[PDB]
Amino acid sequence: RPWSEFRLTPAEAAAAAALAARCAQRYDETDGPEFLLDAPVIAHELPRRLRTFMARARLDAWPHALVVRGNPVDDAALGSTPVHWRTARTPGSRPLSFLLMLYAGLLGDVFGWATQQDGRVVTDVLPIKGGEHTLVSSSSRQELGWHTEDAFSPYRADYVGLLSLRNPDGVATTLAGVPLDDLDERTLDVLFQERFLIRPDDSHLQVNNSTAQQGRVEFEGIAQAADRPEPVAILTGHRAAPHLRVDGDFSAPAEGDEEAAAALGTLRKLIDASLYELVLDQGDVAFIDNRRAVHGRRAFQPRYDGRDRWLKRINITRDLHRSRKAWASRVLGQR
Amino acid sequence: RPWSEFRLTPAEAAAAAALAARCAQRYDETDGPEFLLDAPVIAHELPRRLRTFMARARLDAWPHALVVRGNPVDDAALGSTPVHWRTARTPGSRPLSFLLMLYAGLLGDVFGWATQQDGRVVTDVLPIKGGEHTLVSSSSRQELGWHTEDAFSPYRADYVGLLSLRNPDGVATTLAGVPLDDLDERTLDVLFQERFLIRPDDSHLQVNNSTAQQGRVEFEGIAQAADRPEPVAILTGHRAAPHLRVDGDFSAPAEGDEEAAAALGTLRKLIDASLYELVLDQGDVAFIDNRRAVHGRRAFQPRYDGRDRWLKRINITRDLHRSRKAWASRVLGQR
């Protein structure tokens, strides 16, 4: 498989769950300053075989994601799937939010965005009625097209963490790496040049945040990136193992640059044809390598009956200080 | 103080020492592939108050270094200071090398350079007879001028770790941060521009490595950086908290750029005047923030009697994959 996989034993999974439940008893909130600081050290108490997997697999050269299977979830304890992210911090989902945060702390520094879901660090992926055909993660009937998370931003996550609270119909997450087996050298050369434009996705729009949040100055920086994007490369790093920065629904060539456009159009077709599926069943956790892979989610028919697919999500950076200019409480944004 | 300081209790220090001694009993070498992979997880067993300090202090906005005082060292067990780094992996220093590696694993991914001390990850700082007036860390009578470690390279460490095995005369390490209180806006503007040159320091020269190592192809890349340096900036990141890349003895303006030269000359004088001292006594460990601070070492008169000042040293990155293009066994270099 193109990702690295780990399966908890039932005893390991129970121990991790018990640690998260203890955290939920001892801290008021996952995003509070106290748990943000303490979670990386508390995670040292997770099952050792899991800590070994996370410490080693992050350093491997090849995986598109790190996948951990087998966390127990009881639908009766979890409760119904919220109708909106605003009300999605339910008591039934609270221990599992702490659990995701603990796993994330083994990989890096967690953070959020002032412009996304009210600046929350642990965010929610669930279908919002009336928002089926949008470009944000609360879509359903329209596929979420492949993209680098927050491609517009130099401060985008290194890893995107996902914990599947429920997914009864097995809706697939989509992934693709760099199609290096099919990129000719000239096309590769062009993709490494600063000849492309990449704008903020719709999740950072004020209409996708609560009222009283539309006044955050960080939305100004989002407007600047959408109205005046600066040219950037799509590929960076080692030509034999490039890092990837692209959004299928927001990337464009520089104005009038037809050679850049040809390279991007070629890349689109290669990624479309190599896109593959990862199904996060209930209790599965994935950390997607946001430099090696683009990701999306298949179209699906929402239920709106209380048992819709529901993920918790978290952004992770290897170095919080890389985003110093955007520090707005572990919440990023710029004027 | 401009750095963040932690002092082990005697019991904490004994526990950390016992963990390192166990590591030395169970692994053949500090730089072996096995201990390189295992050390970050073994470090989870270090005293919890120290793990809390390392997890929190790395995320603070201000410190130039993280300093840990109080590791016991017995000069009789340690043995005499080696006459050269080649023979400096003595049994008496072996547990303390494991200890430095364990501490380092709390901060990031350790690595070495094919061109420096035979590609070792744990390296040695000690005075080499006849090499008193050099630009490398085995100098003595000539001050080691302030510099960003491996300023020439985009793959330079985020943190430089130092463990003082002995320092009987209290010779000071030197540090300085960005002199932001005195840089006018125009000078700051220029330092943020790609108008400077920075060449590899003498530690990467073949004459400062063993024979049979002069044939490594990685020395080719060092020659390229010294013969054909590309223009770079000295400051990057947030204008209110810039990251720093400069070498007092190897930085230069771009050819004929007199405004760049004025900015660099101004920066030199401000750093000279703000340089301060940190004395690593026997058993003290420091992790210098190589993005916030330049560092050096005061001139001193070497002894050459077996009790000279002696440090173990290690390079740390927050993200090993940033250097993928230079991956040569956790040892970096390029053709």
Ligand SMILES: NC(=[NH2+])NCCC[C@H](N)C(=O)O
């Ligand atoms: N091509 C796209 N749809 N890009 C935007 C992706 C959606 C965004 N990451 C979200 O969480 O809502």
Ligand SMILES: NC(=[NH2+])NCCC[C@H](N)C(=O)O
């Ligand atoms: N200005 C300088 N002396 N630069 C080079 C510093 C010495 C180098 N870091 C070493 O370990 O030997």
Ligand SMILES: [Fe+2]
């Ligand atoms: Fe995404």
Ligand SMILES: [Fe+2]
């Ligand atoms: Fe140094």
